[PDB]
């Protein structure tokens, strides 16, 4: 906040201020969980594709 | 307008150090008396963008 000074009058003896602000906040996260297996079943009797 | 400020040369601003009553604070006072002019105002001409 920076205003404009208003004149005003030597004589009255007058003038102005200024507030402050301050604030807080907060952060979550996110996850994950990839998960695989590997079993023989995939090996016992399946041949390579590309291959005879 | 001060006690030690009386005819005599003014300066951009008067940043005046005060203390309170009793150990009790600091406050400021901040004074300017100016005024911007032109001695030729015949050579301050403005611009518009629409037909006379």
Do not use: W
């Amino acid at each position: 906040i920076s205003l404009l000074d208003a004149v005003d009058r030597t004589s009255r003896k007058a003038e102005t201020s200024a507030p402050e602000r301050v604030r807080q906040i907060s952060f979550p996260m996110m996850y994950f969980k990839e998960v695989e297996s590997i079993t023989p079943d995939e090996i016992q009797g399946v041949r390579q594709p590309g291959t005879a | 307008p001060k006690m030690g400020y009386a005819n005599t040369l003014g300066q951009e601003l008067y940043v005046f150090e005060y203390e309170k009553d009793r150990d009790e604070g600091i406050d400021f006072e901040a004074h300017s008396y100016m005024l911007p002019y032109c001695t030729r105002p015949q050579l301050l001409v403005d611009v518009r963008s629409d037909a006379e």
